Amino acid sequence: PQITLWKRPLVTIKIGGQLKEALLDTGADDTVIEEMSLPGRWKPKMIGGIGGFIKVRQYDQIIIEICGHKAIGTVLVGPTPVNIIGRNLLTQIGCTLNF
Amino acid sequence: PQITLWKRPLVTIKIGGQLKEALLDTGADDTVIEEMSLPGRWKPKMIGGIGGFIKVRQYDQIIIEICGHKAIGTVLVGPTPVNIIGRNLLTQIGCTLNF
Ligand SMILES: O=C1C(=O)N(Cc2cccc(CO)c2)[C@H]2CNC[C@@H]2N1Cc1cccc(CO)c1
Ligand SMILES: [Cl-]
Ligand SMILES: [Cl-]
Numbered sequence: 001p002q003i004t005l006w007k008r009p010l011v012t013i014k015i016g017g018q019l020k021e022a023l024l025d026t027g028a029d030d031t032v033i034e035e036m037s038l039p040g041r042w043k044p045k046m047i048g049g050i051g052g053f054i055k056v057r058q059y060d061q062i063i064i065e066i067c068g069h070k071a072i073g074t075v076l077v078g079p080t081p082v083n084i085i086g087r088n089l090l091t092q093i094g095c096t097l098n099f
Numbered sequence: 100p101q102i103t104l105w106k107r108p109l110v111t112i113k114i115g116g117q118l119k120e121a122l123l124d125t126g127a128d129d130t131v132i133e134e135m136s137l138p139g140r141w142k143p144k145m146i147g148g149i150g151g152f153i154k155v156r157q158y159d160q161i162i163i164e165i166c167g168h169k170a171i172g173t174v175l176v177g178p179t180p181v182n183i184i185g186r187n188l189l190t191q192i193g194c195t196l197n198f
């Protein structure tokens with residue numbers, strides 16, 4: 001699709017068998033999802049936000065759909081204002097900025 | 100242009116007679132620039148996200164050139180670690196997400 005930016009680019013994702021709302025965020029290196037259960041081992045990850053740094057949990061090779069597009073990749077879990085689809089997964093699904 | 104997301108989408112902007120590097124950030128409602136002089140009245144604002152909040156000054160009707168495309172809108176100025184072009188100006192240059 002082509003998504004304009006007059007409103008927040010909120011889409012439906014599917015992760016852990018559940019539908020959630022998430023923001024397509026080109027300003028985020030990484031994908032960050034609100035607290036939920038994910039399988040496997042996790043590792044620590046520091047992310048740098050506009051207001052400071054925060055530690056979150058990194059899970060790898062997680063199945064996730066974005067706008068119905070299937071992906072598998074790294075998902076961070078922590079206290080994000082909204083679910084964030086960052087560049088790691090945007091690149092995977094072939095998302096670009098255009099003007 | 101078409102900008103892939105393998106790397107941070109940084110572009111050159113011209114604002115207040117200065118050149119700066121800024122991040123095209125579809126996750127940001129607003130545009131926030133590091134400390135610099137701008138003309139006109141301003142109002143204080145708090146903006147925030149995953150890492151916390153910062154205090155900024157809100158300047159309205161500021162002209163910016165983004166990748167050679169001219170736009171006008173509100174610009175927030177404050178201690179941001181990265182200059183951010185948000186949706187309020189991304190729309191004005193015709194920037195969309197595509198996949
Ligand atoms: O921390 C923020 C942040 O504060 N905002 C909100 C924001 C930022 C600028 C201006 C305004 C005002 O509208 C709001 C978010 C928005 N996108 C990523 C902006 N980030 C950066 C971020 C987020 C998650 C992961 C990563 C990894 O790289 C980076
Ligand atoms: Cl990934
Ligand atoms: Cl504006």
Ligand SMILES: [Cl-]
Nearest residue numbers: 004005190193
């Ligand atoms: Cl449009």
